[PDB]
Amino acid sequence: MREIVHLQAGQCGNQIGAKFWEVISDEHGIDPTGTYHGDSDLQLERINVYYNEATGGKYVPRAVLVDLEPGTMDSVRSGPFGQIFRPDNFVFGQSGAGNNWAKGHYTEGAELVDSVLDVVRKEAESCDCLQGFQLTHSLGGGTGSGMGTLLISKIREEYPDRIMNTFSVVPSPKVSDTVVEPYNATLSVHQLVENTDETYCIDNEALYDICFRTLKLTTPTYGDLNHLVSATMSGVTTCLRFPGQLNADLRKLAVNMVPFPRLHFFMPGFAPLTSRGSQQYRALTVPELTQQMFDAKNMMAACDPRHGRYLTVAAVFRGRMSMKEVDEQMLNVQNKNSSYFVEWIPNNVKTAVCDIPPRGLKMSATFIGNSTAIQELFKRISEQFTAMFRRKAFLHWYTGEGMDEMEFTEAESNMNDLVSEYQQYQDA
Amino acid sequence: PLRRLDRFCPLELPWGGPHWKPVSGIYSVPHAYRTENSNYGSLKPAL
Amino acid sequence: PPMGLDTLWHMPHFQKVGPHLATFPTEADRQRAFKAHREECAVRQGTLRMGNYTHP
Amino acid sequence: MRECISIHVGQAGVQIGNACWELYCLEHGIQPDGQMPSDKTIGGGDDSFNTFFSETGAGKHVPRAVFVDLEPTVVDEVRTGTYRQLFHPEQLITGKEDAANNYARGHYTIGKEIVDLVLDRIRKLADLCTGLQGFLIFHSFGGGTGSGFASLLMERLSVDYGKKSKLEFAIYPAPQVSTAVVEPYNSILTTHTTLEHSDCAFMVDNEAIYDICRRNLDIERPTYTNLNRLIGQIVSSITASLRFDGALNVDLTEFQTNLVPYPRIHFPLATYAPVISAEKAYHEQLSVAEITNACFEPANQMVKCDPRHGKYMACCMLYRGDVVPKDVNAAIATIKTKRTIQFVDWCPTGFKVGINYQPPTVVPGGDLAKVQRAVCMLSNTTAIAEAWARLDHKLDLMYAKRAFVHWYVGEGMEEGEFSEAREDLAALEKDYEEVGVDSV
Amino acid sequence: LRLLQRQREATDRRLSEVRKALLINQQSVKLRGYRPKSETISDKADSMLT
Amino acid sequence: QIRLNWEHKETCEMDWSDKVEAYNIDEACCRYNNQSTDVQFYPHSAKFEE
Amino acid sequence: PLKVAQTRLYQRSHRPNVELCRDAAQFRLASEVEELNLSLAALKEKLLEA
Amino acid sequence: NPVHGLPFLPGTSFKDLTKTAFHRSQTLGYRNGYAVVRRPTVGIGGD
Amino acid sequence: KIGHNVDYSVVRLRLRQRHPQVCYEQAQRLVNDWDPRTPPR
Amino acid sequence: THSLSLPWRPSTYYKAASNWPTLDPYCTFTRYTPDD
Amino acid sequence: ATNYSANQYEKPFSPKYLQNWSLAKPTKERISSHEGYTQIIANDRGHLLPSVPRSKASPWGSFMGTWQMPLKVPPARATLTSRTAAGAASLTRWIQKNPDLLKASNGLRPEIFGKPH
Ligand SMILES: Nc1nc2c(ncn2[C@@H]2O[C@H](COP(=O)(O)OP(=O)(O)OP(=O)(O)O)[C@@H](O)[C@H]2O)c(=O)[nH]1
Ligand SMILES: Nc1nc2c(ncn2[C@@H]2O[C@H](COP(=O)(O)OP(=O)(O)O)[C@@H](O)[C@H]2O)c(=O)[nH]1
Ligand SMILES: [Mg+2]
């Protein structure tokens, strides 16, 4: 009745989606064989949000797995849940992007976008009433960043009234995984500004900090990092698939968190994270949820909120809680920290409560926060970009794919204008 | 002569793969899978 | 006492050749960069003098 | 779906490819006869050999390799050796008379004869390639066949395939030892003709590997097989993402984008971090920090160029084995704080990473120890301008008197090509200078 | 007299100390920007650092 | 000497014949899975352990 | 799986003379059949009280 | 090797270390001109 | 009060790192947080 | 062998060592079927 | 000949999907529509009439053998980004030096991209 079509592009997108679909499957009670083995009727009443009906008590995801070279989806398909995807949803070519945005946007992704658009139309027009879209990708690569933005540009032309979410992974400040990554991040951000309704920015070393300081995991694999992104993905749409005292879907959050259309970059967070020996030292209560939720070492982007002002903050609570406690705590958070909240918005907090918690947990909450402190990631990307573009570092790998030299000038101008627009609301 | 201690470990995991169905413990949460509207037309609601 | 290594002899015939890759915005920036790199010859290690600062 | 065609040309190419293909067979399950020992699955079995091996109908895997030489005595050892049944007979091309340390024989007169046969065999091998990525060419800068005919191969492949990726595995001339007199002439000529027909050019010396084998490994008086096994380990760690699972996969197209900043500087240096003997491995923990720091040691480099004499421009790091990405993050964060490691201002990132869970394999008879972690670092540094200047001087001393040019001028190559090859690398000399100065 | 030029390394240390003093001036200027907006005004101390 | 050579060759060769029979048996044992036939119940005999 | 374990134990009993061996696979298959017997006993008792 | 069973939470995944073979398989390939998606038979390492 | 504490820290840091046998790598690790400078235009 | 099963059955080793006498010592599912 | 286009199923018949990794011909994406009927412009044995214009290109194709392709072949990629104006002019003049290789059937297909300063 309100369906979501899920897209994943590139290695980062496919590997995050392989964990996200497993997490949704455990939430709704789906075995690796594809059937349903739930123990409550509430896990079946809203299964059409993410699953398609098939005969024999079997359900299939709405995923469209996209990659330029299928080397990642081969390892995805061999996992414990890799055989539940429909075979026709895998779209692939023979040659990879090679960590090149221009290749994946003009050379290789142009020959592959027709089949992806066909699969998307097939899976989107078979729905009763489409709610929106979800895309997981990265801004440091060439497939998830190059063609992952081409998919948005072609989707928004056809369906210009649907929610377009992007759970992107943004570059880190300390250590780079790609050398040409500032170019890819700049161009993908320039595409993302004018083509998305919400954007959730996730920094890898923020997740490493979470797994090191809060979870005390000596050897966290990339699956452990992807688990947190999956958990913060499934919290945003938990009111579509489960009832609540106070309901809020993607559109309600998009209304409440976006005061101006260009300001839609959010910084996520997942509340009940407890280490392996200290579960007896803390109780699942709303004060001890909101104490961790607003914390700086609990966020998923590497920029503490003390560098700026919160504009709008949301918290989609899950579980059976007294919302008088929720209201009192979210008032106390605003009243105690007067200088870190904007003045011309009387209430900066949007609150949703859903009854059904994650399995094994009494209660949970997913932080989404529109803070002005997102601008320092943008400034880092811009100055790393103009360090290279001043001397034209790697420009021969982009213009040789047919690009124009004013592309990077235009993208840097748009990014700088976005930073200045964020600075406008820093000082009222 | 060795050729086997390189492709294969001479070891086994001391634990089996942890399954994700401790169903008697998942339902040990207070008011397991019970919504808020079930109190309307019942006896004694508290949380 | 062993003296430092020399700069290796080349023909004057191939000393008038210019570069092929222009990696600076303007010519003034080129002049400023080369007129800032040519004071630290005696304090940079290696032949052609494009290395570290030789330290204390 | 990830096939790459290895093109071994010259005695160095064939003797390197022998160790490379022994390790390729041993890493998978393929016997020296081209057959698996058994079919343990009923109908399954991994198809991971498709990167290197092409399966026939019944049970036999054939390598995707062309062995080219102009002398029969190097290929004939493979033809009558242990891996004779493994190789297809028409994949081993052989001339009657060799180039004999002359670029002109390999480029104009003798090497222009067998070029068609190698091109048709390359086309036939690329016909079965479902998902072909690029070519890998193994040669040496000092020989006649490996300098002339490899350049002619690049010459033909650019015409016949366009922008297809072609990585090099060159053997650079050493700064003090050599096994030839006319080696600088071949080096200048085959660098000049392939300054642009190569997307990347990984080079290793021979004296530097001698120093590593003497110092890091416990062995003295080594032979060429000990160097060839190390080069095979390097080329296996480069292509390990195509066949094994990886947290971060590294395609062959990623190297040219993350290691070649400018259209002529495409000469990075390779190094393998935990190259240590068994008894040294017994006393040493080989964590990610130790083997990340050991890559940047000047003594551990496989090319005889001091990195302290130049500036790092781009670094590509490939990890293998029991490797946590958290420790990779911490170790590369530690290195950027160092002052003895200096980078260039216009590349603040300077790193491309890749992690593969497959541990490196132990070939019997090799002196390397079984390790759980390994790094193959490919670093493009400005410090190579010492090597180009020394090669410039060595060409210069002979070209002042025009020694040995009667062997070249009398075989279809004019004198003027020396004058423009030397002028082009003399341009490249200050091309390196322009990218080493900081903007203020 | 060649061994008399062993004080050539002695001025390398002094050049290192001069470069460190430049770095310390950079650190001092960049730390003074952490003052509040009313405090950060033109001052004789900034001219001294320049 | 020729007779001694032939005796040792045939002894090693009987060993190899036994090895190839056992290899065939073990390779047939490896090709067994839950979703296959050619597999039954057998009584718990003491010869399964001897 | 009990069928597969019993068949693997049966086929390996027909190996030739010397290579009738106490491989670790034999201990693994004995533990296989013991573990499956214990699991079956638990499931059957619990079916009875269901 | 007992099997325990835990709830699925963001901080619970215990990797194996007795695993050397990380071979992958070409379950996604091509044909005469067509994208074949064959069924998976083996996992990671040929198991 | 905040301004006074900041200037006292500057004086104390300058006095600490001036004392010789201080190498560079213990001198760049004191004030090291990456603060990007605001957009060019 | 490694372990000591309580009904010790050494007869097949005795036969095999009777035929091939270079076999090394045997130093350290309980009933038969009627077919045996 | 003439390589036409299966309109929906051009993707299976693409030059790279048929395991041909070399340079290939471009296909025809549109077909002109003409009315009427054709005149006869030849006679028996295939000879063109004297009143019909001919092509100045030589018959038996334009194929460059190994011993006829030029020494020191031009670039294949040939991107001009971050180059000296004189040096990029030299590289372009190297491209335009041999027009016989450019118009060959198995000829070079350079991609002159970028702009020097
Ligand atoms: N690493 C390594 N280098 C080798 C090997 N064999 C030869 N070389 C190098 O190759 C150079 C000479 O070229 P060769 O490979 O011997 O012969 P070629 O390349 O076929 O040239 P021609 O003999 O003239 O046909 C020498 O300088 C060696 O450094 C080898 O087995 N391993
Ligand atoms: N944070 C996080 N990043 C990932 C993960 N997998 C891949 N990435 C990121 O993806 C980037 C590489 O881009 P990639 O998607 O592999 O290139 P593409 O396949 O051409 O789109 C790197 O910066 C990685 O940090 C993951 O599981 N978590
Ligand atoms: Mg030779």
CSV table of N, CA, C and O in Angstrom, one decimal, chain F residues 26 29 45-50, chain G residues 5 8-16 18-34, chain J residues 1 3 5 8 12 26 29:
chain,number,residue,atom,x,y,z
F,26,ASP,N,37.7,-43.1,-1.2
F,26,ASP,CA,37.6,-41.9,-0.5
F,26,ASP,C,37.0,-40.7,-1.3
F,26,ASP,O,36.2,-39.9,-0.8
F,29,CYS,N,33.5,-41.2,-1.4
F,29,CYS,CA,32.9,-40.8,-0.1
F,29,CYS,C,32.8,-39.3,0.0
F,29,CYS,O,31.9,-38.8,0.7
F,45,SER,N,27.7,-51.8,12.6
F,45,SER,CA,28.6,-52.9,12.7
F,45,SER,C,29.9,-52.5,13.4
F,45,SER,O,30.3,-51.3,13.4
F,46,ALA,N,30.6,-53.5,14.0
F,46,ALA,CA,31.9,-53.3,14.5
F,46,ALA,C,33.0,-53.2,13.5
F,46,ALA,O,34.1,-52.7,13.8
F,47,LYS,N,32.7,-53.6,12.3
F,47,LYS,CA,33.7,-53.4,11.2
F,47,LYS,C,33.8,-52.0,10.7
F,47,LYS,O,34.7,-51.7,9.9
F,48,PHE,N,32.8,-51.1,11.0
F,48,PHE,CA,32.9,-49.7,10.7
F,48,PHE,C,34.0,-49.0,11.4
F,48,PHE,O,34.3,-47.8,11.0
F,49,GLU,N,34.5,-49.5,12.5
F,49,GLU,CA,35.5,-48.9,13.3
F,49,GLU,C,36.9,-49.6,13.3
F,49,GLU,O,37.9,-49.0,13.4
F,50,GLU,N,36.9,-50.9,13.0
F,50,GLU,CA,38.1,-51.7,13.0
F,50,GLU,C,39.0,-51.2,11.9
F,50,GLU,O,38.6,-50.8,10.8
G,5,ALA,N,26.3,-40.2,6.8
G,5,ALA,CA,27.3,-40.6,7.7
G,5,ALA,C,27.4,-42.1,7.7
G,5,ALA,O,28.6,-42.6,7.7
G,8,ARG,N,29.1,-43.2,4.4
G,8,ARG,CA,30.5,-42.9,4.4
G,8,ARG,C,31.3,-43.8,5.3
G,8,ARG,O,32.4,-44.2,4.9
G,9,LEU,N,30.7,-44.2,6.4
G,9,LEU,CA,31.3,-45.2,7.2
G,9,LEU,C,31.3,-46.6,6.5
G,9,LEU,O,32.3,-47.4,6.7
G,10,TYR,N,30.3,-46.9,5.8
G,10,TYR,CA,30.2,-48.2,5.1
G,10,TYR,C,31.2,-48.4,4.0
G,10,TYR,O,31.9,-49.4,3.9
G,11,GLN,N,31.3,-47.4,3.1
G,11,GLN,CA,32.2,-47.4,2.0
G,11,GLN,C,33.7,-47.5,2.4
G,11,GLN,O,34.5,-48.2,1.7
G,12,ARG,N,34.0,-46.8,3.4
G,12,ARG,CA,35.4,-46.7,3.9
G,12,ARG,C,35.8,-48.0,4.6
G,12,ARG,O,37.0,-48.2,4.8
G,13,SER,N,34.9,-48.9,5.0
G,13,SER,CA,35.2,-50.2,5.6
G,13,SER,C,35.8,-51.2,4.5
G,13,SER,O,36.4,-52.1,4.9
G,14,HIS,N,35.6,-50.9,3.2
G,14,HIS,CA,36.0,-51.8,2.2
G,14,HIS,C,37.3,-51.3,1.5
G,14,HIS,O,37.6,-51.7,0.4
G,15,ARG,N,38.1,-50.5,2.2
G,15,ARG,CA,39.4,-50.1,1.8
G,15,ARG,C,40.3,-51.3,1.9
G,15,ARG,O,40.1,-52.2,2.6
G,16,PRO,N,41.4,-51.3,1.1
G,16,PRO,CA,42.4,-52.4,1.2
G,16,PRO,C,43.1,-52.5,2.5
G,16,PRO,O,42.8,-51.8,3.5
G,18,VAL,N,46.4,-52.3,4.3
G,18,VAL,CA,47.1,-51.4,5.1
G,18,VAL,C,46.3,-50.1,5.4
G,18,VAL,O,46.3,-49.6,6.6
G,19,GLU,N,45.7,-49.6,4.4
G,19,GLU,CA,45.0,-48.3,4.5
G,19,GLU,C,43.6,-48.3,5.2
G,19,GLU,O,42.9,-47.4,5.1
G,20,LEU,N,43.3,-49.5,5.8
G,20,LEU,CA,42.2,-49.5,6.8
G,20,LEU,C,42.8,-48.8,8.0
G,20,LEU,O,43.6,-49.4,8.7
G,21,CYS,N,42.5,-47.5,8.2
G,21,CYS,CA,43.2,-46.6,9.0
G,21,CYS,C,42.3,-45.8,10.0
G,21,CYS,O,41.2,-45.5,9.6
G,22,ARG,N,42.8,-45.5,11.2
G,22,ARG,CA,42.1,-44.6,12.1
G,22,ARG,C,42.4,-43.2,11.7
G,22,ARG,O,43.1,-42.4,12.4
G,23,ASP,N,41.9,-42.8,10.5
G,23,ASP,CA,41.9,-41.4,10.2
G,23,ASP,C,41.0,-40.6,11.1
G,23,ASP,O,40.1,-41.2,11.7
G,24,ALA,N,41.3,-39.3,11.2
G,24,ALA,CA,40.4,-38.4,12.0
G,24,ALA,C,39.0,-38.3,11.4
G,24,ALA,O,38.1,-38.0,12.1
G,25,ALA,N,38.8,-38.7,10.1
G,25,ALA,CA,37.5,-38.7,9.5
G,25,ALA,C,36.7,-39.8,10.1
G,25,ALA,O,35.5,-39.7,10.2
G,26,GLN,N,37.3,-40.9,10.6
G,26,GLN,CA,36.6,-42.0,11.2
G,26,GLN,C,36.0,-41.5,12.6
G,26,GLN,O,34.8,-41.8,12.9
G,27,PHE,N,36.8,-40.8,13.3
G,27,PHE,CA,36.3,-40.3,14.6
G,27,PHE,C,35.3,-39.2,14.3
G,27,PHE,O,34.3,-39.1,15.1
G,28,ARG,N,35.4,-38.4,13.3
G,28,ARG,CA,34.5,-37.4,12.9
G,28,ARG,C,33.1,-38.0,12.6
G,28,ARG,O,32.1,-37.5,13.0
G,29,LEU,N,33.1,-39.2,11.9
G,29,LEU,CA,31.9,-39.8,11.5
G,29,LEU,C,31.2,-40.6,12.7
G,29,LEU,O,30.0,-40.6,12.8
G,30,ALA,N,32.0,-41.1,13.6
G,30,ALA,CA,31.5,-41.7,14.8
G,30,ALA,C,30.8,-40.6,15.6
G,30,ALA,O,29.7,-40.8,16.2
G,31,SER,N,31.5,-39.4,15.8
G,31,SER,CA,30.8,-38.3,16.5
G,31,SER,C,29.6,-37.8,15.7
G,31,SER,O,28.7,-37.3,16.4
G,32,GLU,N,29.6,-37.9,14.4
G,32,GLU,CA,28.5,-37.5,13.6
G,32,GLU,C,27.3,-38.3,14.0
G,32,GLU,O,26.2,-37.8,14.2
G,33,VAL,N,27.4,-39.7,14.0
G,33,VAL,CA,26.3,-40.5,14.2
G,33,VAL,C,25.8,-40.4,15.7
G,33,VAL,O,24.6,-40.4,16.0
G,34,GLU,N,26.8,-40.2,16.6
G,34,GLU,CA,26.4,-40.0,18.0
G,34,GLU,C,25.6,-38.7,18.2
G,34,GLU,O,24.6,-38.7,18.9
J,1,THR,N,47.4,-46.5,18.0
J,1,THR,CA,46.5,-45.5,17.7
J,1,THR,C,46.5,-44.4,18.8
J,1,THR,O,47.3,-44.5,19.7
J,3,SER,N,43.4,-43.3,20.8
J,3,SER,CA,42.5,-43.5,21.9
J,3,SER,C,42.4,-45.0,22.2
J,3,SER,O,43.0,-45.9,21.5
J,5,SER,N,39.4,-47.5,22.7
J,5,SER,CA,38.0,-48.0,22.8
J,5,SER,C,38.0,-49.2,23.7
J,5,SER,O,38.8,-50.1,23.6
J,8,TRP,N,38.4,-53.6,22.7
J,8,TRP,CA,39.6,-53.5,21.8
J,8,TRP,C,39.6,-54.6,20.7
J,8,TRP,O,39.5,-55.8,21.1
J,12,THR,N,42.5,-57.4,12.8
J,12,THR,CA,42.8,-57.0,11.4
J,12,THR,C,44.2,-56.5,11.3
J,12,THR,O,44.9,-56.8,10.3
J,26,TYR,N,50.6,-51.1,17.0
J,26,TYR,CA,49.3,-50.6,17.0
J,26,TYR,C,49.0,-50.1,18.5
J,26,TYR,O,47.8,-50.3,18.9
J,29,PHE,N,28.7,-48.5,18.0
J,29,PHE,CA,29.6,-49.4,17.2
J,29,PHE,C,30.3,-50.4,18.2
J,29,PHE,O,31.5,-50.4,18.2
